Amino acid sequence: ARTTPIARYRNIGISAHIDAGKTTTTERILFYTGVATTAFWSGMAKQYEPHRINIIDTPGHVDFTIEVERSMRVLDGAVMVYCAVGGVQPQSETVWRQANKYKVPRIAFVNKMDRMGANFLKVVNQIKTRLGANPVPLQLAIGAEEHFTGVVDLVKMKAINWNDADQGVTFEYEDIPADMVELANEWHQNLIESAAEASEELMEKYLGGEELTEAEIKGALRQRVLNNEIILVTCGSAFKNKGVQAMLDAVIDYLPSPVDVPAINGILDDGKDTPAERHASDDEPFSALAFKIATDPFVGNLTFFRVYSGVVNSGDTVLNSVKAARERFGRIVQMHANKREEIKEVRAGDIAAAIGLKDVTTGDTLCDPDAPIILERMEFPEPVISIAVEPKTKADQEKMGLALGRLAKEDPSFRVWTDEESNQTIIAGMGELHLDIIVDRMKREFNVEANVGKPQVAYRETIRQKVTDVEGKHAKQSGGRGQYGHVVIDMYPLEPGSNPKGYEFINDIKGGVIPGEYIPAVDKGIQEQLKAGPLAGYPVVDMGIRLHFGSYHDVDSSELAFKLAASIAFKEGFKKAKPVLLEPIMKVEVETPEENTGDVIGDLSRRRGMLKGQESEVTGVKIHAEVPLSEMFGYATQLRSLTKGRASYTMEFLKYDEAPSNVAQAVIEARGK
Amino acid sequence: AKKVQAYVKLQVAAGMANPSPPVGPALGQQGVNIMEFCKAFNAKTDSIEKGLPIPVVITVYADRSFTFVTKTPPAAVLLKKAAGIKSGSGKPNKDKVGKISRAQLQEIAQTKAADMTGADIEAMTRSIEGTARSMGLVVED
Amino acid sequence: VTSYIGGEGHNLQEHSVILIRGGRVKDLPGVRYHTVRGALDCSGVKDRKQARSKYGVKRPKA
Numbered sequence A: 001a002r003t004t005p006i007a008r009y010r011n012i013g014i015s016a017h018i019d020a021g022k023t024t025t026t027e028r029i030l031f032y033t034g035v036a037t038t039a040f041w042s043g044m045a046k047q048y049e050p051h052r053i054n055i056i057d058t059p060g061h062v063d064f065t066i067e068v069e070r071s072m073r074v075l076d077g078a079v080m081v082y083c084a085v086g087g088v089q090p091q092s093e094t095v096w097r098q099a100n101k102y103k104v105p106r107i108a109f110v111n112k113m114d115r116m117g118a119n120f121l122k123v124v125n126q127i128k129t130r131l132g133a134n135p136v137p138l139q140l141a142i143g144a145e146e147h148f149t150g151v152v153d154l155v156k157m158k159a160i161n162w163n164d165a166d167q168g169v170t171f172e173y174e175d176i177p178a179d180m181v182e183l184a185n186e187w188h189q190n191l192i193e194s195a196a197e198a199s200e201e202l203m204e205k206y207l208g209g210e211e212l213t214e215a216e217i218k219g220a221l222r223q224r225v226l227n228n229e230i231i232l233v234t235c236g237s238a239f240k241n242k243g244v245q246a247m248l249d250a251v252i253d254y255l256p257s258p259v260d261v262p263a264i265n266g267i268l269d270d271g272k273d274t275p276a277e278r279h280a281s282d283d284e285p286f287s288a289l290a291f292k293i294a295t296d297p298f299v300g301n302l303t304f305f306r307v308y309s310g311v312v313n314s315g316d317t318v319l320n321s322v323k324a325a326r327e328r329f330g331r332i333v334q335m336h337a338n339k340r341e342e343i344k345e346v347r348a349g350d351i352a353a354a355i356g357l358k359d360v361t362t363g364d365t366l367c368d369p370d371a372p373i374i375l376e377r378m379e380f381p382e383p384v385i386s387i388a389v390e391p392k393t394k395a396d397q398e399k400m401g402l403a404l405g406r407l408a409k410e411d412p413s414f415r416v417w418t419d420e421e422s423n424q425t426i427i428a429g430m431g432e433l434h435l436d437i438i439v440d441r442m443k444r445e446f447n448v449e450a451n452v453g454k455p456q457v458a459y460r461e462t463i464r465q466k467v468t469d470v471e472g473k474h475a476k477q478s479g480g481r482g483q484y485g486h487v488v489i490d491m492y493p494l495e496p497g498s499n500p501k502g503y504e505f506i507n508d509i510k511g512g513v514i515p516g517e518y519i520p521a522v523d524k525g526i527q528e529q530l531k532a533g534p535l536a537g538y539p540v541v542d543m544g545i546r547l548h549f550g551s552y553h554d555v556d557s558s559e560l561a562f563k564l565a566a567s568i569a570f571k572e573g574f575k576k577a578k579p580v581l582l583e584p585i586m587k588v589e590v591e592t593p594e595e596n597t598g599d600v601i602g603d604l605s606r607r608r609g610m611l612k613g614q615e616s617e618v619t620g621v622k623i624h625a626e627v628p629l630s631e632m633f634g635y636a637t638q639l640r641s642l643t644k645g646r647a648s649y650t651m652e653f654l655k656y657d658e659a660p661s662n663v664a665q666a667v668i669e670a671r672g673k
Numbered sequence B: 001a002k003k004v005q006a007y008v009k010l011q012v013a014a015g016m017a018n019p020s021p022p023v024g025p026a027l028g029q030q031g032v033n034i035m036e037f038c039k040a041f042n043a044k045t046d047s048i049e050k051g052l053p054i055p056v057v058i059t060v061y062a063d064r065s066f067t068f069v070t071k072t073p074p075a076a077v078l079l080k081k082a083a084g085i086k087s088g089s090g091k092p093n094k095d096k097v098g099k100i101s102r103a104q105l106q107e108i109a110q111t112k113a114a115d116m117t118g119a120d121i122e123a124m125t126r127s128i129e130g131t132a133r134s135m136g137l138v139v140e141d
Numbered sequence C: 001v002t003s004y005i006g007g008e009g010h011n012l013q014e015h016s017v018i019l020i021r022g023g024r025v026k027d028l029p030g031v032r033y034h035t036v037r038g039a040l041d042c043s044g045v046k047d048r049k050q051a052r053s054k055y056g057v058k059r060p061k062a
């Protein structure tokens, strides 16, 4: 029974730079349609059969662009929202590159045409010049700012005027304003020329002076959008309510259905990585991608999944091929217009959520157990900022682990580990505003009382002076039998990192002054003392010890007596050897626009960052600097402030250098206190 | 050539490749390609001997094309070439680095009068006398 | 109570829902309960093909 063709499905993302107006445009959509959300659209003139629009509203911030990446990958088409005043933003370029990576056929909506400085054609030219795109206006704005009244449809060559009294639910077709007729004819010819380029037949008609029909123009522009050759540009502004309705008609006319998109690539679970495809059909084996996990207070884990092939029912044991885990599907609803119609028939093209999946993560493939496939995996970027989180109480201690676990499950770009040296829980994320939201959820949804600090710098200990002839004599001949042990050691610094063990032991015992059986106990006594340095109780590194002189007693000498002597000798020698506190240094790489370059280093200089050099790149300059871990905290948001949000840094542990005398001494004193 | 707004005289070498990292300086608050440079220098490299950094300019025209401004291996690195002792700068007056004859520069001043442009071959000799003592040299026949 | 960790190397991170079983080790006074290395936070332990039921390892590949 032919019900609603999958060719009527529009799986679309609304994507924009932070602060551009995209969910208000979506709220306008829901109002006009009748209502991840499903909506139904029949056209602003009711000229279309009912189309199913599944909308994913993607975050504007770059701290949550990981969600945008997941969405873009799982979606068919996109609506790119631009501010008429601000135009193409640095963050728009990031989202534009992500949509290019996934080859998402997309259109453009120039919103905020009611604000001061609104300029449609300026934004069209910025899409061309900054994004390297081919923008083709479908519409022209009638007026600007407070004088914005409507739009010209360049396909129909008519003005669209929306009724302000019904919030734009009704519209009239008018003749083009007399001051715009010349400009409308110019852009109509540019639109027809852009349509004619879609095929040799349409190019011959156009060059022959034959007028293209509205159906040929629409079909030709659709083909090129699907090919990602052009971006169709629409305009309009809500509040007075304009554009959205005609942008939704452009979604039907020009954006892909699930059958217009290439088959999804995957790998067979045969151990040979055999390539396979899944076509957008109900008659194919079931395959779906889990793309979002949300924690719900009432139903538990919601796993959002997009079906690409086949059909599944609410309550169907499928196979999580990625995690090799048979997962019985839970309760599955669907946002049928306003209601949440529980669907027991998730067909190809549909987006739904399952309740109570246990071993499913974002990026997992859910498939038919009799036809295993792994759909292509999501690569998750490495976290760029880390902070220490400490529980206030012991109730908060266990609760913290639980809360952070849930947050790491729903958001892979969020990492949590315990630092083995500090025993602090370290949390890491895709920016500090990202970490701020994570902390807020932890101390609200889960209400876990925690302090936010900085990852403790891994302080080390070493000497800066050879000391010779250091006597250690454990002579405890008391309490029954005596315990005699006597060693003489030299202590000397090693070059930093010259020994992968951080420690050298030289046995230079001559004359059997110490029996060879006790020499391992002396070394073990030193190695235990290396774990807790005599200066501040940090591990001692980059040190050599030569045992060359010693003495035993035939009855009273013990293995651990010589280990006690070794510790005495070590503690006395270490204090004489001018002990110092060490530091880690981090190799930092910053990618920035050439005009923002200066600011980056100004701050890095205050952060004790020894700028090694620079590699002027295409974006601008790739500056390299040696910056202490202590000064590499809170840099994500600071960089975002200096560079207006167009810079990305990386950092790696470089080497164990010497902390500046001031820094080292200050910490030594604080630790002693 | 063009205005002094697309002016950085640079290029210590050609085989070290990229003139953007430390090796090649500048490339800051200016904006231009980097591999689009040494290819015209690749038809130009094999006349210059290495160890002799030649000053050329990234002169960018108004239509995105840029080539270089050839001015021959100069005073400083030829006294690290024709004498045989490198930079060592700072000590003209402390200890003896090297004395250079009168005619040892005049034979390469004809090469250096295509590098230095005040007037003449003889007239540029007393500025080969310049940076030599800043490198630390002394000069007498 | 104080529990005991079986196997020879765990997968622990100090906040981990682990399961408890009876049994006194006779060697640590005050440790009276074993853990299960096959249940809920301790997977099939490393490098073992015999008595797989204890320490929870599944049967090997072939």
Ligand SMILES: Nc1nc2c(ncn2[C@@H]2O[C@H](COP(=O)(O)OP(=O)(O)CP(=O)(O)O)[C@@H](O)[C@H]2O)c(=O)[nH]1
Pocket: A016, A017, A018, A019, A020, A021, A022, A023, A024, A025, A058, A059, A060, A061, A111, A112, A113, A114, A236, A237, A238, A239
């Ligand atoms: N006057 C006017 N206001 C608009 C229009 N479109 C949106 N707005 C308003 O702007 C705001 C829209 O949210 P905005 O902050 O700009 O977008 P965003 O930050 O990208 C959404 P998110 O937080 O999910 O990233 C709302 O206050 C909305 O009422 C418009 O066309 N005209």
